[PDB]
Amino acid sequence: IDPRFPHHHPRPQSFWEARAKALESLLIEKGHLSSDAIERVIKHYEHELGPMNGAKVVAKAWTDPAFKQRLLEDSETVLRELGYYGLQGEHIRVVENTDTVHNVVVCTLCSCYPWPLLGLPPSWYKEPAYRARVVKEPRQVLKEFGLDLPDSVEIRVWDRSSEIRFMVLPQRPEGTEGMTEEELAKLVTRDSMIGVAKIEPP
Amino acid sequence: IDPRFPHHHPRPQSFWEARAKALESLLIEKGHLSSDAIERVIKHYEHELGPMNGAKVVAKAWTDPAFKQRLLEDSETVLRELGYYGLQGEHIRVVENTDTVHNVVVCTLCSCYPWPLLGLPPSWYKEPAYRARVVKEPRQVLKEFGLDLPDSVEIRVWDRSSEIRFMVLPQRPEGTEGMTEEELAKLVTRDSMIGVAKIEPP
Amino acid sequence: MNGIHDVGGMDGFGKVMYVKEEEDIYFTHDWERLAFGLVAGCKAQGLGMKAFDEFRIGIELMRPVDYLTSSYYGHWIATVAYNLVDTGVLDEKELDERTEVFLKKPDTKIPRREDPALVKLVEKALYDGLSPLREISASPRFKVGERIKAKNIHPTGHTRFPRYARDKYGVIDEVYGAHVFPDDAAHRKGENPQYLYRVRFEAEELWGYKQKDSVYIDLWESYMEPV
Amino acid sequence: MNGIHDVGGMDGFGKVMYVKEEEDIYFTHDWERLAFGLVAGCKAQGLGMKAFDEFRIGIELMRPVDYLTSSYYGHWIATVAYNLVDTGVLDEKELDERTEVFLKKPDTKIPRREDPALVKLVEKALYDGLSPLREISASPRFKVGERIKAKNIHPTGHTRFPRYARDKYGVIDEVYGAHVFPDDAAHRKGENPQYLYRVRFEAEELWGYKQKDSVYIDLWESYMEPV
């Protein structure tokens, strides 16, 4: 390494791995962490949370006009009553896609995402391409997801610069007549609750 | 390489090396380049040009008031008359450091530098730290070079966004009484002609 | 800070890597799982960080070349290390030595310890969260519908004001209430809560572009001024 | 393009690596020397690039992770490759295959050829340079001393208008004359020369900072509008 150019040389991912283990070891030795505390977190985020919670909220909104009304009027109270609350989900708002308004959520500065309601964010959501581009050329970004909106549809991008979180409420597709709330929930995709996809007819 | 994350993985410098050789080989095979054309360029930039040319211009300005006047009035004509002209030196301007005005030159967008007059730029001149910072906190950048200007001195940063080039004309230091033009030229540093240093008394 | 993290409006980062949800694996390496445990475990106890503000600045401070190559949980490792050293929980020399141990001997045994009280404490944190909403005695400076000036400010420390939105006109969409102020809190300078607003910006104003696009950004009161 | 290259005003890139001039080695690897020969040799003949505009956009288009890690002459290799393929001088498949050859067998022999006519041609280019100054029939829109508005424009192709200077007020310092217009020329869309101006911006205006600092930037006429 030429000392003029240390900034050309990234840490290898083996460094981060070693660093993680070093932190883990030191913190447990010092009594700050325990094996079971670390595992409890991993269980929560890898297994206990997921987009199925948001899916249930969407299906309920589709099937129960009074619920949808309450949700849109005061989402934070309603979501907390359902138990979809916690770390990074203390203040969750809901915005409805309509025929002429399309909503897209992003954290340009990092990755902010409502874990208690949606689970962990998509891989791409945290990466620079989506973050950089969606606030400036959302139509181009959406097209890469297969969503080609007409010029006449307004796009609203919601950049999560504070701890306020947003979920998109996507429209119920055609072809779903007679489906139960539980069956509609299975239609609701993670991507549709971020705004990068509409829901396909069954 | 996880295909979600190809952008995490830089080309190694061995790639650029191989690419360079591949270009060289193909272009010579196709009759576009020759061994001697490539060598001629390397000789010019590594050996024929350098900051000594600017140093001579500075020393002349210090020793010949009429020359300094002409240089400051019409640098492009004067420099061309001296033969300090060529690729990336077609339009060269000169700005004088004074007791209350300090000049610093940068190419924030790349590396633009007057090769015919000063030779190749410093390593650091082309790198992000200098480029990013000097337009916003020049006092902090200058301090890293050992130049700690008083608040009362105005700083003018000249960002080379066009093909117009600038050389800084630094002030003649104390302690140089009786020195010849040739001896003064040996005092003129590359850094002083960029604006990141004053010239020390001998 | 005007850092590599602040990517909104940048060109050149390429196509978005679309992947079907069911194929979008959360973790591919155990150290990534561990990173999550470290962050949440420390935060639950206020070790190195109490809210996300301090967490974010540690990431923002990464070398750009590291930020772009570490992978996402690499950011988390970087900021835990940064903050634990910065607050005096860990010593840098000891951390570096131990890092070296695991670099040269990756299969080095991790010490085991069960602490069910700590588990309950961490669990409580995951479920209770930590709201930054506060009450203050002042009234909001701005009103819904007001056209405001998003200031041209350039803090060298932490901010939540993306560069792409600076020096722009926008319209107040909502007054959320007073929230802990990141530009102070990230540097352990007090909660000093300020009114937080949602502000709508038009594409024409942000970019000079002609499509029916807008961006809704949350801005603290001190980021803005009246017109 | 709002790319990784456009670093003016960014925080986080760290200290400047000071080195004494006499110790500041130009080249540490032969491929770096070769990069210079490739660029100047091609440019002298108008191969891939005729002026520096096309040269710059090829660098600006690099993957950010490459831009930050390739080292400086790596940029030059990237843009020669880009432009020679883009203009049809070289075929991408052939270039990639040959790259692979030198990757696996670095000591592969380089073909030798002497072309003294080409040497003279290259030499002429090094000494004669290539001025972008033109004359146009129009008069300048702006005058020395005029307070202008540096527009909020966001071209997705090449521009010489740094982002830090956009959406700002400045003062005309000089009218240089008409120069070949980079935003068109880099994309082979004609010289279409426009008046080029030097414009002074104050620290207070660029950053909201309070020191006696200013930046003099060269801006093409179409980057600005009257107030």
Ligand SMILES: [Cl-]
């Ligand atoms: Cl929808």
Ligand SMILES: [Cl-]
């Ligand atoms: Cl001086």
Ligand SMILES: [Co+2]
């Ligand atoms: Co975030």
Ligand SMILES: [Co+2]
């Ligand atoms: Co340059």
